Symmetry: C3
Subunit: 450 residues, 3 copies
């Protein structure tokens, strides 16, 4: 039964439901794809390129198996990198990556082999012959992707998005406004950034107003490219009321290597968030908040590869509710907000929070949590406290095209398995199941973000 028809499906009801939704087009509110690569439409050369070269999950697991970096991010050939992953792939059994990579192979290349030393070479060769006919745009069309949203920096000119709107066929590729750098006054680089922003937008950014003026122009810049959302990464959401003169003072201090106090950083951040909210009210943008990623926990990884290189963890010790309280009461009914949490242990907080504010939505299982297990828990749980029906929608969070489909498949099977179970336990009539499941997989998120 490996990756077969009833993969992840445990009841008959689940199977009708999945059959009802499997061919719905993919709507992807958030991913880490680059538009330039779609516009250039260049094939891939290797399964390594496609599957491991830019997947930090793969790097992690690979390191967790005792495979030196030579073959992870280092200077060994793709083919060698590939052979090592396969050598060790059977130890990944149980973890979503094991399933995703195989799903790509079976659904995209139609190579139904199981990965291991024994199979490594035959798979490498079979994929090499097939990779050429494969292009992003061909893949986008094959996987029925209707809309994508990438994550972009306020400073970006959105050039490729422009070109994609022009020439890319049946996909809508929207940018998403992520102003985290702007917000992070603790980051070395903040100043260079604040300096770049004034440059690109024509503003005295060494002043808060000028920087805000620059952020607003950035936001308008994004509006004009069909953008409908802001993504925000926060460890401990701490939003309270922050005076402009204090904000102004801190902002100016920041331009002069002052080690700012925690209060200064916090005040600065609380303030910037309220301003992102104001900006987004004026455009009716969905405000996504990704809470709880402790980043660059692992020093050696930071100093060597830097961010997003495999050393971020979650922590359970976070004041969520009292930290969002001001923001949420402030934009109550005025702003669509979607909440994500990295520690599933915090679902209840966000879930109850969403139960009490019609403008707030619970996101899909986020990072370490997007796994059949996490999806089962996240959904069953969320269904019993708010409404499954308002789930913001599946998010690929993917760095690689092939994932899209397989990621989308996994999600829909699990969601359809979850509802199936409830249908068979007699909690949900089949009719409304069929409707619930369709809404969540497509109509709902489409309506919400677009």
């Amino acid at each position: 039964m490996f990756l077969g028809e009833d993969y992840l499906l445990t009841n008959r009801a689940a199977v009708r439901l999945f059959n009802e939704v499997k061919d719905l087009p993919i709507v992807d509110p958030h991913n880490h794809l680059d538009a330039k690569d779609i516009v250039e439409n260049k094939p891939w050369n290797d399964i390594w390129e496609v599957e491991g070269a830019t997947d930090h999950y793969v790097w992690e697991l690979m390191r967790r198996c005792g495979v030196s970096e030579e073959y992870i991010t280092g200077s060994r050939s793709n083919k060698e990198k590939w052979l090592a992953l396969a050598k060790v792939f059977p130890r990944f059994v149980g973890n979503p990556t094991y399933e995703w990579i195989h799903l790509d192979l079976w659904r995209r290349f139609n190579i139904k082999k199981v990965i291991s030393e024994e199979t490594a070479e035959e798979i490498w060769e079979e994929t090499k012959k097939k990779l050429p006919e494969m292009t992003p745009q061909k893949l986008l069309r094959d996987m029925k992707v209707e809309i994508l949203c990438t994550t972009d920096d306020p400073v970006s000119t959105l050039e490729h998005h422009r070109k994609a709107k022009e020439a890319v066929e049946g996909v809508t590729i929207l940018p998403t406004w992520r102003p985290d750098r702007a917000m992070n006054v603790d980051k070395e680089g903040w100043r260079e950034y604040v300096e770049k922003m004034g440059e690109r937008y024509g503003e005295d950014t060494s002043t808060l107003d000028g920087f805000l003026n620059a952020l607003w122009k950035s936001h308008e810049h994004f509006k004009e490219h069909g953008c409908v959302a802001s993504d925000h990464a926060l460890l401990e959401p701490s939003v309270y009321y922050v005076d402009e003169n204090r904000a102004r003072a801190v902002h100016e201090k920041a331009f002069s290597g002052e080690k700012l106090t925690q209060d200064e950083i916090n005040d600065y951040k609380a303030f910037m968030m309220v301003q992102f909210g104001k900006m987004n009210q004026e455009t009716n943008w969905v405000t996504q908040l990704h809470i709880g990623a402790l980043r660059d926990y692992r020093d050696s990884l930071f100093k060597t590869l830097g961010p997003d290189s495999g050393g971020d963890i979650s922590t359970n010790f976070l004041r969520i509710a009292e930290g969002l309280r001001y923001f949420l009461n402030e934009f109550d009914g005025k702003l669509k907000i979607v909440l994500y949490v990295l520690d599933p242990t915090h679902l209840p907080t966000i879930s109850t929070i969403a139960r009490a504010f019609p403008n707030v939505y619970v996101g899909a299982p986020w990072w370490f949590n997007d796994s059949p297990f996490g999806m089962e828990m996240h959904l069953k749980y969320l269904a019993s406290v708010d409404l499954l029906y308002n789930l913001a929608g599946m998010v690929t969070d993917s760095r690689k095209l092939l994932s899209f489909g397989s990621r989308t498949e996994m999600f829909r099977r699990v969601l359809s398995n979850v509802v199936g179970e409830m249908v068979e336990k007699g909690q949900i009539p089949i009719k409304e199941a069929r409707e619930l499941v369709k809404h969540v997989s497509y109509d709902g998120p489409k309506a919400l973000f677009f």
Copy 2:
């Protein structure tokens, strides 16, 4: 089959168990019913009155579905309020309310239709014709409710409880001593309250001793009406050792609009809790503690409807163990205490706490948590750490009569499903399962509170 016989049952064993307990009478340690309504024995007029008019859960989800307040707590006719709920009811699929309301329809009115715009009018008309023969006392008798306990304020006269003991034929309706207002010195009307209390009990309440004297008379007042329990709502249980002079100082400060320090509030609360424990020792009352409800989180709801209007949430950031420690060691073996937790994430704390103090009991899944999902997790989990057998007992927490039976059904099915499973995996012989299940559904709780 929706809401059929094996609703919530997943194994044969479960079915024997459920059949064993389905006809046991209902014992309801805690609910938010009014005795006056039971004594007056007035029929309801509408399914709206019966199902939505006073159910804040229904208010929540309706708001979560985008239905304006006009049709929630506003000025639209019951019939319009009803039609809106049904219009949108299919989006509730997955949430316990969807099941509860249908269960009432099927078990009480014998209307086996599924709620939707298509069905709205036919249901409304069928229920209107049947609602007359329906009364509280007839319903109490029908649903086999043997004992209820409402929640009452220390100031109450318990008049209708008196009347109900006199005239209500096969139900025992007991009041429950909830002294939260007395405890909450941060609340606006604390003073007015402290003033009322001395008035009804004849004490100079602007003095701690006089207030205490007043609370004790209240407690004796309750004793005389067959009361056997105190309910306490606490966000962050913080009980330590508080001097009467300090307590006395704070109490007097509180009578003169002093913005008291957090330490003053805390000390005053710590002190009041210990004195509630003392009072309960002398009467051997069960002390219920409901931990973790962040209330009136949503401002607009507070300013508009006020409390219990749909804006309370849970939060995971609570120091439970070290906050209960003083209390618990203090009343170790001297007081029956039941713990409830709003965030399921905190079960392990309370569960291990209960595992170490024979006077401490773990309550049923509490608020956002009473849902087939919540019950399954709460129970399996609790069973593996302490003893399912000492579970305090199912609690309806309901504001509406009809719920009682359906609430009681759901619970017993799930409980019986959970033990069924363990019987089928060979962890529990069927004989002790039958015993376990019967004890938990009736005998245990009845013995524990009565």
Copy 3:
């Protein structure tokens, strides 16, 4: 329906093949609370009570939770009376792992397939009495196929019986494990007496940090020489930061003179000692086990009466794990094999992601209140979805009683095999790798990690 039979805990066919694959693998037990002297003396037990309840604080708890006075728990009533009370009340244990463990021992070891209750009490006591003679530790160690054990030992210990066990016990390797908690706990009443004992046995001026360290290192070398390969550490709130030796020295000297030390002093002292235990372990390549989250002696009456490990320790969800481990972890990144255990399952995600980012870190088995078919199913499925089930540190018995070993080991392997079975049948894992995964986790993996 069938209780404690062949498919006990098994919910799918795949699970059954997997379990049959591993049920006969020998037991490797990285951590337990056994005493080597009892193994060396090889003395039979007298009663089921002795064997099952006399020294099992879980049984003490549940009995107290059933309303049975201490007379019959740790008090002065005869074993037989203690036993009869336990049975009287045993049916109320239904659902809790102890109910299943004790029965498993009866059925797998004594072959007494009866179910425990008042009705059965006397017939079980009499059947076990006749069988208990032929039963010995060493006979049991051989019967239950235990290849390796590791006890928990205090740095002051002379490891005498471990010596004798190496010599005369054939078939089993009984290793000591270095637990320096007392040394670390400067808040404890007898810390000083301890610090004094340590210098005595190791010949050092312990009123001094260097001397105490010198003493700890000698203890560590003392353990090395008895084939020890691990240190166990119990911490509530791991708070490891950077602590200067002069401050450490200052605090240590203060501690020798009844000074109520400040929380910072205690914390500093602990942070410092942990980094030093890490250093000592680097030099020997010892596995560093950290058991996080036990609030102990929470219940006073139990403390004043029986003291520690008597049934009054609880878990708490309010712990800063990640930022507390951060210095340690970044400090020994790639240099030290660390295994993490968490007492509140709600903290798994932290340790699990932590382990996902450091190849030298391993997630332990479900620990205390969590080792239960329920805890194991959750712990495992969960861990599988975030790091690799395949690197699980390995099952740990944690047991204070021999008979448990096998039953403990059985429960675990069934559940592990039930969990993997499920994923095999949902089509997430080919059967070949499942067979491999399951065998690795049950034996080869844990063996190579600790040994």
